[PDB]
Design an enzyme around this catalytic site. Sequence first.
Site, PDB file in Angstrom:
ATOM      1  N   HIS A 124     -18.175  71.981 -33.890  1.00  0.00           N
ATOM      2  CA  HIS A 124     -17.916  72.806 -33.047  1.00  0.00           C
ATOM      3  C   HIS A 124     -16.600  73.663 -33.455  1.00  0.00           C
ATOM      4  O   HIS A 124     -15.696  73.035 -33.804  1.00  0.00           O
ATOM      5  CB  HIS A 124     -17.954  72.312 -31.651  1.00  0.00           C
ATOM      6  CG  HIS A 124     -17.290  73.345 -30.694  1.00  0.00           C
ATOM      7  ND1 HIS A 124     -17.954  74.444 -30.429  1.00  0.00           N
ATOM      8  CD2 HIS A 124     -16.496  72.992 -29.825  1.00  0.00           C
ATOM      9  CE1 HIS A 124     -17.423  74.977 -29.447  1.00  0.00           C
ATOM     10  NE2 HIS A 124     -16.120  74.100 -28.833  1.00  0.00           N
TER      11      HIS A 124
ATOM     12  N   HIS B 147     -13.902  75.153 -31.664  1.00  0.00           N
ATOM     13  CA  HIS B 147     -13.353  75.052 -30.382  1.00  0.00           C
ATOM     14  C   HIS B 147     -12.554  76.316 -29.940  1.00  0.00           C
ATOM     15  O   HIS B 147     -11.573  76.430 -30.322  1.00  0.00           O
ATOM     16  CB  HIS B 147     -12.829  73.747 -30.112  1.00  0.00           C
ATOM     17  CG  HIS B 147     -12.319  73.711 -29.042  1.00  0.00           C
ATOM     18  ND1 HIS B 147     -12.659  72.425 -27.889  1.00  0.00           N
ATOM     19  CD2 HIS B 147     -11.663  74.596 -27.721  1.00  0.00           C
ATOM     20  CE1 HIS B 147     -12.201  72.419 -26.542  1.00  0.00           C
ATOM     21  NE2 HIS B 147     -11.559  73.839 -26.821  1.00  0.00           N
TER      22      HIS B 147
ATOM     23  N   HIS C   5     -14.159  70.348 -34.496  1.00  0.00           N
ATOM     24  CA  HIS C   5     -14.465  68.850 -34.423  1.00  0.00           C
ATOM     25  C   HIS C   5     -15.992  68.685 -34.446  1.00  0.00           C
ATOM     26  O   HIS C   5     -16.704  69.429 -34.182  1.00  0.00           O
ATOM     27  CB  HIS C   5     -13.780  68.176 -33.326  1.00  0.00           C
ATOM     28  CG  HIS C   5     -14.170  68.911 -31.987  1.00  0.00           C
ATOM     29  ND1 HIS C   5     -15.456  68.549 -31.073  1.00  0.00           N
ATOM     30  CD2 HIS C   5     -13.567  69.780 -31.093  1.00  0.00           C
ATOM     31  CE1 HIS C   5     -15.447  69.253 -30.170  1.00  0.00           C
ATOM     32  NE2 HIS C   5     -14.503  69.923 -30.109  1.00  0.00           N
TER      33      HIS C   5
ATOM     34  N   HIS D 227     -19.374  67.719 -33.246  1.00  0.00           N
ATOM     35  CA  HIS D 227     -19.749  67.725 -31.663  1.00  0.00           C
ATOM     36  C   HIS D 227     -21.259  67.045 -31.712  1.00  0.00           C
ATOM     37  O   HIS D 227     -21.965  67.559 -31.084  1.00  0.00           O
ATOM     38  CB  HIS D 227     -20.078  69.167 -31.229  1.00  0.00           C
ATOM     39  CG  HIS D 227     -19.644  69.365 -29.918  1.00  0.00           C
ATOM     40  ND1 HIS D 227     -20.406  68.765 -28.893  1.00  0.00           N
ATOM     41  CD2 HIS D 227     -18.939  70.173 -29.109  1.00  0.00           C
ATOM     42  CE1 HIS D 227     -19.794  69.090 -27.480  1.00  0.00           C
ATOM     43  NE2 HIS D 227     -18.977  69.882 -27.828  1.00  0.00           N
TER      44      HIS D 227
ATOM     45  N   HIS E 159     -10.230  64.191 -15.686  1.00  0.00           N
ATOM     46  CA  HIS E 159     -11.102  64.835 -16.479  1.00  0.00           C
ATOM     47  C   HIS E 159     -10.798  66.087 -16.983  1.00  0.00           C
ATOM     48  O   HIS E 159     -11.155  66.958 -16.063  1.00  0.00           O
ATOM     49  CB  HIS E 159     -12.577  64.556 -15.808  1.00  0.00           C
ATOM     50  CG  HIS E 159     -12.988  63.349 -15.421  1.00  0.00           C
ATOM     51  ND1 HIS E 159     -13.302  62.392 -16.174  1.00  0.00           N
ATOM     52  CD2 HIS E 159     -13.201  62.684 -14.307  1.00  0.00           C
ATOM     53  CE1 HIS E 159     -13.497  61.159 -15.630  1.00  0.00           C
ATOM     54  NE2 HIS E 159     -13.307  61.455 -14.501  1.00  0.00           N
TER      55      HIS E 159
ATOM     56  N   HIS F 136     -14.054  71.465 -20.157  1.00  0.00           N
ATOM     57  CA  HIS F 136     -14.387  72.775 -20.967  1.00  0.00           C
ATOM     58  C   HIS F 136     -15.343  73.369 -21.188  1.00  0.00           C
ATOM     59  O   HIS F 136     -16.633  72.701 -20.792  1.00  0.00           O
ATOM     60  CB  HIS F 136     -14.145  72.003 -22.407  1.00  0.00           C
ATOM     61  CG  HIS F 136     -14.398  72.942 -23.637  1.00  0.00           C
ATOM     62  ND1 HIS F 136     -13.748  73.945 -23.662  1.00  0.00           N
ATOM     63  CD2 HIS F 136     -15.195  72.928 -24.511  1.00  0.00           C
ATOM     64  CE1 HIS F 136     -13.995  74.782 -24.819  1.00  0.00           C
ATOM     65  NE2 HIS F 136     -14.851  74.255 -25.382  1.00  0.00           N
TER      66      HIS F 136
ATOM     67  N   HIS G 180     -17.836  76.035 -23.084  1.00  0.00           N
ATOM     68  CA  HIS G 180     -18.059  76.780 -24.403  1.00  0.00           C
ATOM     69  C   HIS G 180     -18.203  78.411 -24.157  1.00  0.00           C
ATOM     70  O   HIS G 180     -18.750  78.912 -23.033  1.00  0.00           O
ATOM     71  CB  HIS G 180     -18.945  76.446 -24.967  1.00  0.00           C
ATOM     72  CG  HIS G 180     -18.738  75.038 -25.655  1.00  0.00           C
ATOM     73  ND1 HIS G 180     -19.238  74.720 -26.791  1.00  0.00           N
ATOM     74  CD2 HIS G 180     -18.521  73.853 -24.935  1.00  0.00           C
ATOM     75  CE1 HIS G 180     -18.890  73.353 -27.286  1.00  0.00           C
ATOM     76  NE2 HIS G 180     -18.485  72.907 -25.910  1.00  0.00           N
TER      77      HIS G 180
ATOM     78  N   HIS H 206     -18.429  70.526 -20.095  1.00  0.00           N
ATOM     79  CA  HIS H 206     -18.390  69.128 -20.073  1.00  0.00           C
ATOM     80  C   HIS H 206     -16.975  68.409 -20.203  1.00  0.00           C
ATOM     81  O   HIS H 206     -16.022  69.299 -20.422  1.00  0.00           O
ATOM     82  CB  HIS H 206     -18.913  68.569 -21.092  1.00  0.00           C
ATOM     83  CG  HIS H 206     -18.449  68.824 -22.522  1.00  0.00           C
ATOM     84  ND1 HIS H 206     -17.450  68.073 -23.277  1.00  0.00           N
ATOM     85  CD2 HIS H 206     -18.780  69.918 -23.339  1.00  0.00           C
ATOM     86  CE1 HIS H 206     -17.284  68.707 -24.256  1.00  0.00           C
ATOM     87  NE2 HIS H 206     -17.784  69.625 -24.391  1.00  0.00           N
ATOM     88  N   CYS H 207     -16.618  67.489 -19.712  1.00  0.00           N
ATOM     89  CA  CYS H 207     -15.644  66.550 -19.863  1.00  0.00           C
ATOM     90  C   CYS H 207     -15.278  66.331 -21.188  1.00  0.00           C
ATOM     91  O   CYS H 207     -16.159  65.936 -21.893  1.00  0.00           O
ATOM     92  CB  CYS H 207     -15.551  65.282 -19.159  1.00  0.00           C
ATOM     93  SG  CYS H 207     -13.731  64.481 -19.305  1.00  0.00           S
ATOM     94  N   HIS H 208     -14.021  66.862 -21.833  1.00  0.00           N
ATOM     95  CA  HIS H 208     -13.688  66.659 -22.990  1.00  0.00           C
ATOM     96  C   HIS H 208     -13.084  65.253 -23.441  1.00  0.00           C
ATOM     97  O   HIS H 208     -12.757  65.023 -24.382  1.00  0.00           O
ATOM     98  CB  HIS H 208     -12.625  67.877 -23.695  1.00  0.00           C
ATOM     99  CG  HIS H 208     -13.018  68.397 -25.190  1.00  0.00           C
ATOM    100  ND1 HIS H 208     -12.874  67.464 -26.152  1.00  0.00           N
ATOM    101  CD2 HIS H 208     -13.218  69.561 -25.370  1.00  0.00           C
ATOM    102  CE1 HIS H 208     -13.343  68.445 -27.256  1.00  0.00           C
ATOM    103  NE2 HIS H 208     -13.422  69.514 -26.594  1.00  0.00           N
ATOM    104  N   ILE H 209     -13.309  64.429 -22.442  1.00  0.00           N
ATOM    105  CA  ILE H 209     -12.870  62.943 -22.724  1.00  0.00           C
ATOM    106  C   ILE H 209     -14.189  62.505 -23.763  1.00  0.00           C
ATOM    107  O   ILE H 209     -15.325  62.736 -23.089  1.00  0.00           O
ATOM    108  CB  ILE H 209     -12.710  62.060 -21.893  1.00  0.00           C
ATOM    109  CG1 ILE H 209     -11.293  62.446 -21.372  1.00  0.00           C
ATOM    110  CG2 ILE H 209     -12.550  60.466 -22.107  1.00  0.00           C
ATOM    111  CD1 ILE H 209     -10.777  62.061 -19.790  1.00  0.00           C
TER     112      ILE H 209
ATOM    113  N   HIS I 173     -16.781  60.181 -22.268  1.00  0.00           N
ATOM    114  CA  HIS I 173     -17.068  60.432 -21.081  1.00  0.00           C
ATOM    115  C   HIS I 173     -18.616  61.357 -21.192  1.00  0.00           C
ATOM    116  O   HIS I 173     -19.379  60.955 -20.497  1.00  0.00           O
ATOM    117  CB  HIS I 173     -16.415  60.894 -20.084  1.00  0.00           C
ATOM    118  CG  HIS I 173     -15.173  60.204 -19.495  1.00  0.00           C
ATOM    119  ND1 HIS I 173     -14.274  60.510 -18.735  1.00  0.00           N
ATOM    120  CD2 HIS I 173     -15.120  58.656 -19.674  1.00  0.00           C
ATOM    121  CE1 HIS I 173     -13.254  59.517 -18.478  1.00  0.00           C
ATOM    122  NE2 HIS I 173     -13.848  58.469 -19.235  1.00  0.00           N
TER     123      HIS I 173
ATOM    124  N   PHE J 252     -21.609  63.072 -18.813  1.00  0.00           N
ATOM    125  CA  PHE J 252     -20.848  64.023 -17.976  1.00  0.00           C
ATOM    126  C   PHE J 252     -20.901  65.523 -18.738  1.00  0.00           C
ATOM    127  O   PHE J 252     -19.692  66.112 -19.084  1.00  0.00           O
ATOM    128  CB  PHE J 252     -19.080  63.511 -18.149  1.00  0.00           C
ATOM    129  CG  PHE J 252     -18.515  63.717 -16.859  1.00  0.00           C
ATOM    130  CD1 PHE J 252     -19.082  64.000 -15.712  1.00  0.00           C
ATOM    131  CD2 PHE J 252     -17.131  63.255 -16.746  1.00  0.00           C
ATOM    132  CE1 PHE J 252     -18.574  64.393 -14.300  1.00  0.00           C
ATOM    133  CE2 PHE J 252     -16.410  63.423 -15.390  1.00  0.00           C
ATOM    134  CZ  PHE J 252     -17.046  64.073 -14.266  1.00  0.00           C
TER     135      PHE J 252
HETATM  136 CU   LIG Z   1     -14.075  62.343 -18.307  1.00  0.00          CU
HETATM  137 CU   LIG Z   2     -13.409  70.869 -28.555  1.00  0.00          CU
HETATM  138 CU   LIG Z   3     -15.602  74.304 -27.083  1.00  0.00          CU
HETATM  139 CU   LIG Z   4     -18.106  70.845 -25.981  1.00  0.00          CU
END
Ligand SMILES: [Cu+2]
Ligand SMILES: [Cu+2]
Ligand SMILES: [Cu+2]
Ligand SMILES: [Cu+2]
Length: 496
Positions: free
Chosen positions: A64, A66, A109, A111, A394, A397, A399, A449-452, A455, A460
Site C-alpha cells: 500500500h 499510504h 507498507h 498490506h 484507535h 484510516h 483509503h 480500518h484501525c491502523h494498529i 487490531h 477491525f
Molecule cells: Cu485499534
Molecule cells: Cu497505511
Molecule cells: Cu492508506
Molecule cells: Cu489500510
Amino acid sequence: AIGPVADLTISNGAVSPDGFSRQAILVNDVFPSPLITGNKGDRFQLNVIDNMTNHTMLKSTSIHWHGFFQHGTNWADGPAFVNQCPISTGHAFLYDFQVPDQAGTFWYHSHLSTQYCDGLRGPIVVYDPNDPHKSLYDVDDDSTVITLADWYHLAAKVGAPVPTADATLINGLGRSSSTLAADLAVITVTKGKRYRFRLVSLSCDPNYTFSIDGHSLTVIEADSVNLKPHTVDSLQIFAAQRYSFVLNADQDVDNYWIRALPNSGTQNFAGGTNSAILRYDGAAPVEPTTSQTPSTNPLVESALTTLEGTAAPGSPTPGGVDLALNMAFGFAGGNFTINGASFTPPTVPVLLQILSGAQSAADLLPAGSVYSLPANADIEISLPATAAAPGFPHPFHLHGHIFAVVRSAGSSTYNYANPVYRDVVSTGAPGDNVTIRFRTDNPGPWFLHCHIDFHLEAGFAVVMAEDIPDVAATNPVPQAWSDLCPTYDALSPDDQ
Ligand SMILES: [Cu+2]
Ligand SMILES: [Cu+2]
Ligand SMILES: [Cu+2]
Ligand SMILES: [Cu+2]
C-alpha cells in the site's frame, strides 16, 4: 532517493536496528526500507519483486502507498483481498499510478496481514516546486525525513497477538532495555538554518509523543495536507500519521535529545531509549545531556486548520450531509467488530468481485462488512470511542480519500468552518465522538480500518464500496493484476 521509477526487491535477512539480531524483511537489501521520492505530477512505476522465502513472515506480499488517492487505479491501492490478491514469491508486480493533485509526506507498507511489522515499511516524499510553504525553510531533503517505528524481538506471528514493543526506532535506530549501548540516530543541522523535517509514523501500534529539547516545532503539514503554520513544543503522532514541521536551528551549538515517547512498552528515556540526537555542526560527537522541560504548548488537533481554511463538505450541522454513518465498535470472540461484523478477508478480492458482476453491498463478501456509498455525495462518519473495543485510542484510516475532522478526540466541539483535513485520525477514549466528512469522488472499494495492525488482523475494519456501478469503467486493470489471483490460488499453503 530512489523513485519515481524503481524496482523494489523484497527479501529476507538478518537485521539489528537496536543491537539485537533477528530475521526480518529487507527491501533492496536493506533495513529499514528505503526512502522513495518524487515530485508533484509524477507517475510512479514501482516494480515489486518478491523473493521472500520465510513463511513465518509470509512469502507473499502486497504494498500500500499510504495517502495516495489512486483515482482510476484502485487496483494498485494495495490491501490484500480488497484491492488485489497478494504477489507470490518468485514473481513481480508493477504498481503504476499517477499523483496529479497531491504533494507531501507519505509512506509505503505491506498490506498483507501483519507483515509490515516484520519490516516492509518506508517513507515517501512527493515534493512541490511551488510549495506554498517553501519560504519557511532552507533545507528539505532526504536527510530531513524522520521516521518513527516500533520494533519487536519476536516476529509478528511468533509473539503475542498484540505484542509490546522492545524498542522505538528513529530513522531505523534505537536502544532497547536489553541493549543500551546500541547506536542512536543522529540528525545534523547547521546553526542559523531552517529545516523542514518530515515526521512519519511507520508504527504498527504505539503512538508517540514527540519533542526536541530546547526547540519548538512549527507544524505546516498533516497527512499530506498543507496547514496554517502552528508552533508547538510537542506533538502526539499516531500510527500512520505524518507531520511536517519547521525547525529553526537557532539554539547554541550542542547536542539535543530528540524524544519519542510511546504509549505502551518502555515509557521513559532511561539510558537513551526512545531517543535520537539532534547534532549541531560543530558539536562534539557525544550524547546529549539536555533536559526535557514540560510541554506547555502541545499540539491540539482541533486547533489545526488547512492553509486555505477550507470548509468541511456539507452543511454546518450534525447530519448535514447526504449519507451519515455511525460505526459502532465492539470486541467478541477475540475479534473486533464494527456494527456487529468482524472483517475476514474474502477468497476473491472485493475489487474482483465487483468487476465480476456484484452490484450491491449485499452481493459483496465478506458479508456485513461492506458499505455502499453513493457517488458525488457528502458523507459523514462518526466513530465513537468505547471501552468495548480494547486497545484504544484507535487511529482510523480511510483509503482513497482525505477527510475533514469536524470533531477531534478530547474535544466536544464541532468545526465545519475550517477544520483540519487528514487521512488518519485518533478516535480517542470513552466520551469522544470523532466525526469526519468527505465527498465521494473516487469510485472503488476503499478500506476503512484501525491502523494498529494487530487490531486490523483481528478484524477491525470495513470496506467502503464507492459508486459501485462506475468501478469497472473508471478503473481498468492491467493483465498482470488479473493474473495475481490464479497465481496465488495455486500456491501450496506452505508458500503463502
Ligand atoms: Cu485499534
Ligand atoms: Cu497505511
Ligand atoms: Cu492508506
Ligand atoms: Cu489500510
